[PDB]
């Protein structure tokens, strides 16, 4: 058995392993999410598609349950482990209490795992950041965000990855109860919020929307293509 | 400059710097004083001034009906040791339906404290103690050390600046046996007054007093229960 | 032992007797067979008294911890599931139980029956014990969903009274509770002897 | 970089960790032992640091069994650990085989235990050496001495401590093979008082013990009358 | 002890994993392997690294390792780790078949292996496997497929990939000669031969420096067949002819 | 270089000395004990106007008579909070009565220092915690307020302040406090000092406040009552 | 109780220098030679004792594993003994399960798996030895070679130990595919003779053969006749 | 033990002023065969504690070994404290209970006598963990045949002398020999006083009168 | 091998306005013979709590030792002594912990509450307990219960005003009840202990019954 302290304190009370994990998550592809009136949407950037892949196998937007979905930035191999553990937890909760989970319940579970890997012997921290969205039985949309340290908040709209430093300033100024009225209004909002960070031009973006019905619907390339023309 | 990190490395002079440092930890604390007469043993401690608003501390704890201790050093380690001593006395009374001799208790404590000092990736308990008890053979004032060896003494003081209390103690040890309880306690409070700097005298809430004896269980004296003892120290 | 419970228009009604026996000797004559789990839940006691009491105390503790963690109360379905799961770990070791959980949630009146075997079923009228077959004959013939509170009270009292009149392991007093939207209340603790003169001449 | 572990030979085939645990003993106060026809006699110069302690604290003579004594030198905590191990070894032997353990067997068992701590990086060697001694109608008196490395030899008189050099030199001029315990005890008192330094250390305590035929094979402590007389004789001899 | 520990599973001051970065450079110098997907099946085509005259060709292949009745792979990097991985893949496929009484899908196989590859980078103190894999297969849902894993533990579906040595230029020239949807198996073989002919520093191929396998469906059955030296020689002759004719 | 357990030439335990420095980088909290109850108050320290302020919970409830306010590593504090809740529920289950603030502080302080990297446990801690706590509540002796450190030393206070501005917050608390307060003047002064030391503007959504008193349970202030109090001040 | 971290790690260029160093150790052993003929294999070693005091009969370098397999080595003898013991155990387990003699290829695969396990576990070094396996099953002779890393090959004629480069450079020329076992022995002996620095004797070398009837090492009385030519 | 094999019979006990006297016969029965005829069923624990046991003999020997090692080990460091009759009575009760709770009991009915601090001790410890004190004891068939005479005497006079207690003990041993079919005509007699424990060799009840 | 024995004994508690009373007999038995004639069953727990036990004597002894240890652990951890309700709850949990090989005891806790009045708690071997006003367990409980029903409960009789139980009348009732129980049950009758838990402290008395 391997029992060593990998992440330990430092002069001035820093955790260098966690700081390095965050410096790593600061290099992924940008993700953006907003919370609508009756809809929730996410959006991820594709650095390059390479003209030879199969996009069905490199998707960064999964579905943990009927009403919960997520999108990450960082390291895909770690993201996969976290996602599968969250799926098993959702099934256990359904089995024991006879009701689908809340968004905050699964956010707490994920954050607890991430924190546990910062204080155990013989482990390094996870190198991913997640954005979790969904609806509940009340009919209230939610949007959260976790960190490699185990801390999570609730936000109106947020952006993770590289270029988030400008996506956040853009979204701060432009977010208002007017761009929220309708789905084809919020979706164009998200698209123009992502486009000024995509310096390639055009659509190198994946965009998934989730409404109270027809869950985790994913916009087709042609459909997403139409919106870009409308903006211009 | 490579022998001062692990507890399992000897120096070219046959010393263990880690055990040393763990002792220099014990010197940081506030002074204590113990002593015994023909029929009673006594502990007196000086609760340190933490801040302008907080209740001072707990420096004297019950171990059993006849045993009590007083600590100086890491309080977490101190109460970790106190739990072990309490379980020892409880186990004794369960099996033999009688109390425990203070000497056998201190033997168990030393044997337990020694093991960490030898293995890799472990550190010594950073706390010194002062035990007081009554038994068939009379009082006892044992003292322990971070390095697991313990002593037996008529009167001993541990803590910062306790050199003066130790000098006073030996200089006046000639009469501790015959002296009465009131006389015995005052001898303790004077000795404890010695270590304080010039700007402070014993008040009524920065001192504690423990007492065990022939026909009397171990008792601790509260903030204003120590008033009948500090009335004469002119 | 005789316990009953039936949902109706205005919530749930619960009743019981109070005698406990070891063989043919009546040890106690006023036990409490309704177990107040919290201000908003309640169970009932039939089978082994020690098993009943112990496991419903465990359940009360877990409901409190659920509330503290999730900032919301548990529901009747979830509480029944927790109890059934807890006792399924000791199947075949000799536990003796059989209980009823009643309460109100966002879905209205709830009435569940959990056993030592491991079953749980939703219903509109249950009855447990060794006078259960005597109480059924009166509940089935008097019950109606279009009934109000005092008619329900009278029907429950009459069922328990005739059950303890014909059964040897039932007697003493009858304790009546009532689950409404705003928690439960205690209605009456009349004694079967002072009921019998009322119910005849 | 070869001084930090008991798993590293020096380029010349040495183990400096054991060499340092030996210095730990090579600067501790002296204890001697003397074998005789009738029995054995232990003697230790016990140091009194300050007046405050009661006389009787920090004893260096233990009772490992009802016929085995033991004198120690070095770290007293390690010494007490070893004494418990030895008590454990003797009790198990009696429960297995139904009679008392031979000193030759006990010393072999304890030396193996000590040597097991000289091979690994997870532990450190003990820092104390000690002497044993018994008496049996079968084999008579005996005397052994174990080192921090785990070597155990038989002796006629041993001088573990700091004044080993001066102690051994004076004990060799003794003719112990013909004396008796009553006649040896005085000699132990005298030689310890001679080897004792009275400058660095000002005050010292003296305790003695013996196991022989006069005690019927039981290890004891020398009675108080014999001790006082021995001290007087030593003082007279010293001048 | 802490003095001798090498700390294989920690982050770098910039968020990197140095042991994985070094295993990737190990895999950088291995023998060239390449795969190509088509309408009627997939194909692998590796390069023979040990060409000594005194060797023996007892095995039906050197870097193929049929894993199941429907799949097969190929490796680059360290043979000793490759053997462990291949044994593990076979065991996973048989456990799936035992539980469900149906063959396993290719994505599930690749996933179950990449989990094991990832668990070697997060805890344990060991070093990671220095091996990259390519897979080919056929299942009920998606038909002919072609994947690729790497030491870190992340995979991805492709249509024409390449690992090993000079894989950069291999993929560069693959991008300009592959047309989605219209490629048949024969045009696939032609492109594979003509890419291998260049991305190998030698003057020209030898029909024994290469190793070629295909995969097809025939009569409701999967057939995995390693091509023969004469077939390869004929293909090389065909490549020699047409290329010569153009100029 | 070193291990986690390693004394210094002053016998200081380097790792604990660093975990203590990890607290001078948190947001200030304040507790105050009265003869009529206790009050807790903590700055929320919002980052950007897009973050929901109802999602920063730094004052939790341990039981119907005990509450807690933390500072430091909010990710670390959650295991302590959970274990305190579980211990209180166990005590109720076994003895049919409510625990005491002293007992809860003492049981929580016994998890500190329980770390190491060899022969510790199957799954054990690898470093000390980085959270300081503040307990408040009422029991069979009245309102009480305790304080906990990462070293494991717990004291009993009547007006304590923890955080990154405490060396300035106590310099005012020692002048303001007296043994004849009421909870209302306590609340007023606890708000005045916060306003004194904070960087933003003390309005009704970037602070938090709760109170326990001998009559009622643990109760949190509302954005109605809180606003009225702030406006009234 | 033991270290849990690896002692073999990757370098900035992707090498494993502990394995490279175990190979450098192997390159300093005694010469070994194997040659596969039309109806058998031949292993021939240099068993050169330090002085005349050493009793030659006590220790052997050519050992059997089953009734049809035998092997030799180059590198470190104390490691070779561990490998021999585990190979014997592996063969016995296979026979216990299948009631059939194990084939040479399965034997080599299991041995190389063990040698690979010693490159990635905690607190150990790799073996400092390479092997040369011999066998005969289903009417065919086999000859493999195993490396310290865990990679095995298959040859027609190879050479290990010191001067292996010139050994195989000379071995390539003479080798014929129609060679009989008795005429292959001459070439094996001659190859050893190229780099011996001394005079050949019936106790300077060891020789084992394997054909249809099983494995056996020749006796000095027979090595004498073979050396006479 | 599941099934006892070689068993002893009744042990007696009386306490007089300044001492305690106990007695037992020397016989091991192999289920109605008098197999061994010179075994000692009485132990001396230390200078103030005696012990006699009934039932299985191998269990008695095991407990002898254990108790002896305990007394030795506590006497080793000789710090001035020693075990007492009461401490040994408690230790024995605890060990018997711990064995019965695992369903693997020791099959004896021990009796502890002692004299410390200036007053006597006499205790009883059954195999199930039942334990008490009394001024007289008897195990086995003695509980029916000898306890009535002891109680008849101690009713009138609450205190006896050493001589009277010894006379009473032998007068009861005679009747045990008359009426018990597992009894023998050779017994030992131990006695603890302020000077220590004394055991007396093979005595006989030759005071028989068979007038048939 | 049966790990249980039946040893007799009767216990009886009665709660009043200011007081509380536990009583018991002093005979120990096994089968048809008498072990001792002076063995109590009432144990003082704290200055305001007494507990009476009945059933199997080995379990009674073990249980009282465990309870005495846990009171001290609680006091050392909480800086105050336990209360009667906390003691009853803890006893419930202790009895349930051994539920597949249980203590064969019938416990009867008595004491004063924080508001200064009697509190009788009855227990069954596996944990079930309830606060009563009087209770009787043991070998003559079916003989004692109807008499207490008629006297303290005042049942089945009209033409009476039912004024509370003074200490005098309570003690007289306890004495007469035990005399009549001794005249008909073969397991009671050596002597009678009476513990009185009151504000000042616990008192005890003794009365003789008729011998066998």
Curated annotation (Swiss-Prot), chain C:
Major enzyme class: hydrolase
Location, primary (coarse class): cytoplasm
Binding site for bortezomib: 49
UniProt-listed Enzyme Commission number(s): 3.4.25.1
Reaction it catalyzes: Cleavage of peptide bonds with very broad specificity
One BP term from GO: response to oxidative stress
Induction entry: Down-regulated by theophylline (THP) and up-regulated by 1,3-dinitrobenzene (DNB), two reprotoxic agents thought to induce infertility.
Subcellular location: Cytoplasm; Nucleus
Superkingdom in the source lineage: Eukaryota
Listed GO CC annotations: cytoplasm; cytosol; nucleus; proteasome complex; proteasome core complex; proteasome core complex, beta-subunit complex
Active site: 1 (nucleophile)
GO molecular function terms noted in the UniProt entry: endopeptidase activity; peptidase activity; threonine-type endopeptidase activity
Keywords on record: Cytoplasm, Hydrolase, Nucleus, Protease, Proteasome, Threonine protease, Zymogen
Protein function: Component of the 20S core proteasome complex involved in the proteolytic degradation of most intracellular proteins. This complex plays numerous essential roles within the cell by associating with different regulatory particles. Associated with two 19S regulatory particles, forms the 26S proteasome and thus participates in the ATP-dependent degradation of ubiquitinated proteins.
Protein family according to the UniProt entry: Belongs to the peptidase T1B family.
Name assigned to this protein: Proteasome subunit beta type-5
Gene (UniProt): Psmb5
Included range, full protein: 60 to 260 of 263
From Swiss-Prot, chain D:
Coiled coil: none
Residue list for modification Phosphoserine: 237
The keyword Nucleus is assigned to this record: yes
GO MF annotation terms: ubiquitin protein ligase binding
Keyword Phosphoprotein attributed: yes
GO biological process, one term: proteasome-mediated ubiquitin-dependent protein catabolic process
Chain positions with N6-acetyllysine modification: 51, 200, 224
Tissue expression as described in the entry: Ubiquitous.
UniProt-annotated location(s): Cytoplasm; Nucleus
PROSITE patterns: PROTEASOME_ALPHA_1, PROTEASOME_ALPHA_2
GO cellular component: cytoplasm; nucleus; proteasome complex; proteasome core complex; proteasome core complex, alpha-subunit complex
InterPro entries listed in its UniProt record: Ntn_hydrolases_N, Proteasome_alpha, Proteasome_alpha-type, Proteasome_asu_N, Proteasome_sua/b
Principal location listed in the UniProt entry: cytoplasm
UniProtKB keywords: Acetylation, Cytoplasm, Nucleus, Phosphoprotein, Proteasome
Assembly and binders: The 26S proteasome consists of a 20S proteasome core and two 19S regulatory subunits. The 20S proteasome core is a barrel-shaped complex made of 28 subunits that are arranged in four stacked rings. The two outer rings are each formed by seven alpha subunits, and the two inner rings are formed by seven beta subunits. The proteolytic activity is exerted by three beta-subunits PSMB5, PSMB6 and PSMB7. Interacts with AURKB. Interacts with CDKN1A. Interacts with MDM2 and RB1. Interacts with the C-terminus of TBXA2R isoform 2. Interacts with DNAJB2.
Family as reported in the entry's similarity comment: Belongs to the peptidase T1A family.
Protein name: Proteasome subunit alpha type-3
Organism for this UniProt entry: Rattus norvegicus (Rat)
Underlying gene: Psma3
From Swiss-Prot, chain E:
Keyword Lyase annotated: no
Location(s) in or outside the cell: Cytoplasm; Nucleus
Record-stated family: Belongs to the peptidase T1A family.
Pfam family, one: Proteasome_A_N
Entries under InterPro entries matching the protein: Ntn_hydrolases_N (IPR029055), Proteasome_alpha (IPR050115), Proteasome_alpha-type (IPR023332), Proteasome_asu_N (IPR000426), Proteasome_bsu_CS (IPR016050), Proteasome_sua/b (IPR001353)
Tissue-specific expression: Ubiquitous.
Domain of life: Eukaryota
Record bears the keyword Cytoplasm: yes
Organism encoding this protein: Rattus norvegicus
UniProtKB keywords: Acetylation, Cytoplasm, Nucleus, Phosphoprotein, Proteasome
GO terms (BP aspect): proteasome-mediated ubiquitin-dependent protein catabolic process
Protein name: Proteasome subunit alpha type-4
Primary location recorded for the protein, binned into one broad class: cytoplasm
Modified residues (Phosphoserine): 12, 74, 172
UniProtKB/Swiss-Prot annotation, chain H:
Keywords: Acetylation, Cytoplasm, Nucleus, Phosphoprotein, Proteasome
GO process annotations (BP): negative regulation of inflammatory response to antigenic stimulus; proteasome-mediated ubiquitin-dependent protein catabolic process
GO CC annotation terms, alphabetical: ciliary basal body; cytoplasm; cytosol; nucleus; proteasome complex; proteasome core complex; proteasome core complex, beta-subunit complex
Entry keyword annotation includes Membrane: no
Keyword Cytoplasm assigned: yes
Modified residues (Phosphotyrosine): 57
Induction: Up-regulated in cardiac hypertrophy and hypoxemia.
Lineage: superkingdom: Eukaryota
Principal localisation: cytoplasm
Subcellular location: Cytoplasm; Nucleus
UniProt-recorded Gene Ontology molecular function terms: lipopolysaccharide binding
Complexes and interactors: The 26S proteasome consists of a 20S proteasome core and two 19S regulatory subunits. The 20S proteasome core is a barrel-shaped complex made of 28 subunits that are arranged in four stacked rings. The two outer rings are each formed by seven alpha subunits, and the two inner rings are formed by seven beta subunits. The proteolytic activity is exerted by three beta-subunits PSMB5, PSMB6 and PSMB7. Forms a ternary complex with SMAD1 and OAZ1 before PSMB4 is incorporated into the 20S proteasome. Interacts with PRPF19.
Similarity section: Belongs to the peptidase T1B family.
Protein name: Proteasome subunit beta type-4
Annotated source species: Rattus norvegicus (Rat)
Shown part of the complete sequence: 45 to 256 of 263
